[PDB]
Design a protein around this ligand. Structure first.
Ligand code: FES
Ligand code: FES
Lengths: 163, 163
């Protein structure tokens, strides 16, 4: 099992909310992603349960990040969607068979499990060391300084006005 | 996100093969772990296809490592069993919806995909930097010098004697 499809979506969602820098209603995010408002709202639940997004009420209400983009790491978003479980799971096969390691000697993790855990720690360190602010800065530098502001304006234009 | 159960088994198999002075039949490895020969054989065929173990014929035939333990990395074993696919797959969601990035502006990978790719590279680099010889050295240090030789002796004892 690799990462679920929700990780790609949730990372893009955090970048687009930073671009808006004002509450974005479910309907406007849903239009941007070409899905229904009710489907978008269901996907947002992973980010709201993790305390990364909240809902603002009122006529120009909608979703906002709960803290600045520099305080949201890629690891925060990945764990919001796919949870905290490591990729490698030790099933304690060293406790099997006629030369089984007795449980009283199985307090410390298997050296194999520890090496796999150290590799996972490098993956998590890389995700923890990168922020939503870094992604926004790279999009700015490569798409131009007008690209994300354009997305932000499109999301919030006309909110609280009836045409 | 999960690595298949075969990774744990294949890493243990590589470690115990270092302790054997002769080819080890799949049947003896299976007996040591009190596990189905057919399950063990599938993990050993994955290691064989990756060029990490080979089958020796004759009366005391069985599996041997194809090269020294110091030349076999955790990455070699993980990819032999779970394949080369990364954790994160970009589905080009930036090409969706009314503000879709046109193909001509999709010459570079998405910055989000590149950040996830950098984390994957950190994971692979950690697995590539640890060898079966490192695992053996750690087992010798923590289980004592007699642990692996005990397993090695058990695996090869009596082969070709018919008691
Ligand atoms: S007993 Fe699970 S990795 Fe060794
Ligand atoms: S389009 Fe796939 S990670 Fe951005």
């Amino acid at each position: 099992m690799k990462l679920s499809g929700g990780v790609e979506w949730a990372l893009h969602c955090c970048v687009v909310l930073t671009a808006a820098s004002r509450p974005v209603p479910a309907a406007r995010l849903a239009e941007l992603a070409d899905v229904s408002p009710s489907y978008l709202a269901k996907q947002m639940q992973a980010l709201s349960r993790a305390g990364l997004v909240r809902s603002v009420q009122g006529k120009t209400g909608g979703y906002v990040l709960t803290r600045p983009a520099v305080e949201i790491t890629l690891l925060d978003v990945v764990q919001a969607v796919d949870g905290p479980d490591p990729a490698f799971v030790c099933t304690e096969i060293r406790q099997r068979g006629p030369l089984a390691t007795p449980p009283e000697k199985c307090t410390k993790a298997c050296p194999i499990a520890r090496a796999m855990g150290a590799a996972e720690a490098a993956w998590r360190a890389s995700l923890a060391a990168t922020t939503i602010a870094d992604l926004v800065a790279t999009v700015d530098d490569e798409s131009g300084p007008d690209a994300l502001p354009g997305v932000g304006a499109w999301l919030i234009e006309g909110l609280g006005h009836h045409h």
